[PDB]
């Protein structure tokens, strides 16, 4: 005996008001931490390309992205402007 997945069938109507937003004047001015982090990532990316390592070390890093999800939410965009959503 196992509980059945609830589809939670819903239809939505997007409000045009969600797309109306203006940025602050200083939005595009990056901070010392954001500029130092970006330059460190550039130096680390060049270093990673330079490192002499075996396949086992390569897999240990790549494998970090493999376990996050086992369910999905699907949406369908309909010709009449309505959005149909459910759980699978």
């Amino acid at each position: 005996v196992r509980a059945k997945l609830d589809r939670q069938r819903r239809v939505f109507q997007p409000s045009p008001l969600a797309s109306q937003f203006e940025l602050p004047g200083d939005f595009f001015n990056l901070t010392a931490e954001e500029i130092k982090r970006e330059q460190r990532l550039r130096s680390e990316a060049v270093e990673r390309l330079s490192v002499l390592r075996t396949k086992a070390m390569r897999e240990k890093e790549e494998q970090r992205g493999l376990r996050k999800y086992n369910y999905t939410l699907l949406r369908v965009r309909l010709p009449d402007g309505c959005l149909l959503q459910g759980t699978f």
Partner: protein, 269 residues
């Protein structure tokens, strides 16, 4: 400087060189510093054109003219003492020279301390550790390391306090300390400009650093120190001091420490 004088047209390079010497006399006492001497006056036997040999002759006669130009000393800088026309190094002219070389671990620490005179350092900053890590670095590189560490401290703290303007409050400046992480970051950004050249230094190895070889340590003191500590006994007995010793045997037994340890006690390079 060589390349600027050489960038001039024939006749202009000689005129400009002569003017500098005449101005030094007018403003005597004066020092004339010629940078990249090997570029302004390269070996004549290594060039082909008349203009390149001409400028060497022009400098050679101007150097001799210093017997008339009272209180004028000409200094020059090159990368290699044997890359300049040998005539320049003949009696008179450039009859003295000094080997600057590369600073050692002690000199590098001194340079870092000099370029931090105004900087407020945090308790975790260890400039001796930096000086030991910065192998192959020269003063130009160590100065960059200090300025880079200062800038990182400014961007982390002060840019969240001060305006994007030219004038800063004295209190905010003095409230900033530069941490060891800012120096280590600069070390990752800098790259030594003189890593391949041989570095001559007074070693820090002492006799207590060598295990065993008790008689060899004493023997080196007899060979190296006694000829100058007790010269009257060597003359009295007509004994000619040895000029050197050869070590042989397995590797990794202390041959290097033996030579450094005697150099250390003698305060020798």
């Amino acid at each position: 400087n060589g390349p600027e004088i050489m960038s001039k047209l024939a006749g202009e390079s000689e005129s400009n060189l002569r003017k500098a010497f005449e101005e030094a006399e007018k403003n005597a006492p004066a020092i004339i510093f010629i940078d990249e001497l090997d570029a302004i006056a390269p070996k004549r036997e290594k060039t082909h054109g008349e203009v390149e040999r001409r400028i060497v002759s022009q400098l050679l006669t101007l150097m001799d003219g210093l017997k008339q130009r009272a209180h004028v000393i000409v200094m020059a800088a090159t990368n290699r003492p044997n890359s300049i026309d040998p005539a320049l190094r003949r009696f008179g002219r450039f009859d003295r020279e000094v080997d600057i070389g590369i600073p050692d671990a002690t000199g590098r620490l001194e340079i870092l301390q000099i370029h931090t005179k105004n900087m407020k350092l945090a308790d975790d900053v260890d400039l001796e550790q930096v000086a030991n890590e910065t192998h192959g670095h020269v003063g130009a590189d160590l100065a960059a390391l200090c300025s880079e560490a200062a800038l990182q401290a400014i961007r982390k703290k002060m840019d969240l306090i001060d305006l994007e303007d030219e004038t800063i409050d004295a209190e905010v400046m003095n409230s900033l300390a530069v941490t060891m992480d800012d120096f280590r970051w600069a070390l990752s950004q800098s790259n030594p400009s003189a890593l391949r050249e041989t570095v001559v230094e007074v070693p820090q190895v002492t006799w207590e650093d060598i295990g065993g070889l008790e008689d060899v340590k004493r023997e080196l003191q007899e060979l190296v120190q006694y000829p100058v500590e007790h010269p009257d006994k060597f003359l009295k007995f007509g004994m000619t001091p040895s000029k050197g010793v050869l070590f042989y045997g397995p590797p990794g037994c202390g041959k290097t420490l033996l030579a450094k340890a005697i150099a250390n006690e003698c305060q020798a390079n």
